[PDB]
Ligand SMILES: O=C(c1ccc(Br)s1)[C@H]1CNC[C@@H]1c1ccc2c(=O)[nH]cnc2c1
């Protein structure tokens with residue numbers, strides 16, 4: 541009942557911003573560009589410092605012409621409209637957004653701990669208590685997002701940041717979409733795609749719960765449940781209905797994952813009459829205090845190392861590229877509402 | 879081992895999204 545009350549208020553706040561999005565709330569020249577933190581098909585994220593406050597941020601720079609060539613116009617509009625409207629302890633905040641002749645800009649909170657991806661690959665795998673701590677945060681984040689009729693659609697260690705307190709911050713809302721009922725877009729990352737996506741079946745929020753199963757598996761195993769050298773081989777494994785677990789996986793863990801990695805939607809945890817509660821109440825989560833997690837009162841598995849503000853040693857190095865702004869406006873109409 | 883197979887695979891680096 542307290543959960544319903546909280547979510548009801550959360551939706552009221554979200555819908556106000558959803559219907560009236562913030563737009564043009566800063567300018568490129570207000571930020572000092574320092575270093576690239578990550579890259580994508582049509583842009584990059586750079587560590588920046590806001591000159592008037594001295595605050596550090598992570599600024600995503602999207603080349604409008606590249607967005608259009610990859611047919612991601614509506615997805616980029618989705619991303620910005622959603623991210624400026626949401627608010628949850630484990631979601632990165634969009635602080636400013638604006639555009640110029642050449643690029644779109646999304647100025648987000650900088651999360652100095654780096655990607656879960658980097659730590660997971662380096663350490664090999666997380667213990668189950670460690671993986672559970674992260675997993676719980678995704679569970680609550682998805683409960684929140686789904687209550688707003690949003691689907692996230694790109695869960696993976698590369699899209700999860702670790703903050704200074706050791707907590708998760710979900711970023712990368714590029715495929716996030718607000719949809720009541722059913723949607724069809726083939727998108728995501730091969731290892732994490734639900735069978736209904738690759739089979740072009742038409743799908744809903746249940747694909748996020750499948751992806752959570754993939755994520756928990758990979759965190760606790762050190763490798764995903766479905767992997768191969770070519771995506772087609774990955775897809776063949778995903779739809780096959782077969783999954784094998786490391787012998788070190790607990791029996792509770794295996795039970796949870798068999799229910800999350802359920803090819804049959806009518807049997808998938810997160811998608812039954814009991815909704816997210818079949819997950820929250822699963823044996824594997826019996827020690828999880830969902831409220832303490834939300835309030836950030838639980839001791840994290842580890843805190844990332846930090847050496848003063850603006851330090852980036854928790855991020856890989858990327859090739860840098862000067863930002864150029866054309867003297868002509870590119871793709872004005874397509875991105876008008878940004 | 880499954881772990882050794884993973885580490886020798888071409889997909890232990892960052893994975894690109896697909897679409898379209
Ligand atoms: O560089 C990134 C890109 C995504 C799309 C394009 Br174009 S480039 C993301 C990818 N996965 C994490 C990466 C990233 C890195 C740092 C931050 C940060 O500190 N705050 C908020 N979001 C971040 C996202």
Ligand SMILES: [Br-]
Nearest residue numbers: 580581582583
């Ligand atoms: Br991108």
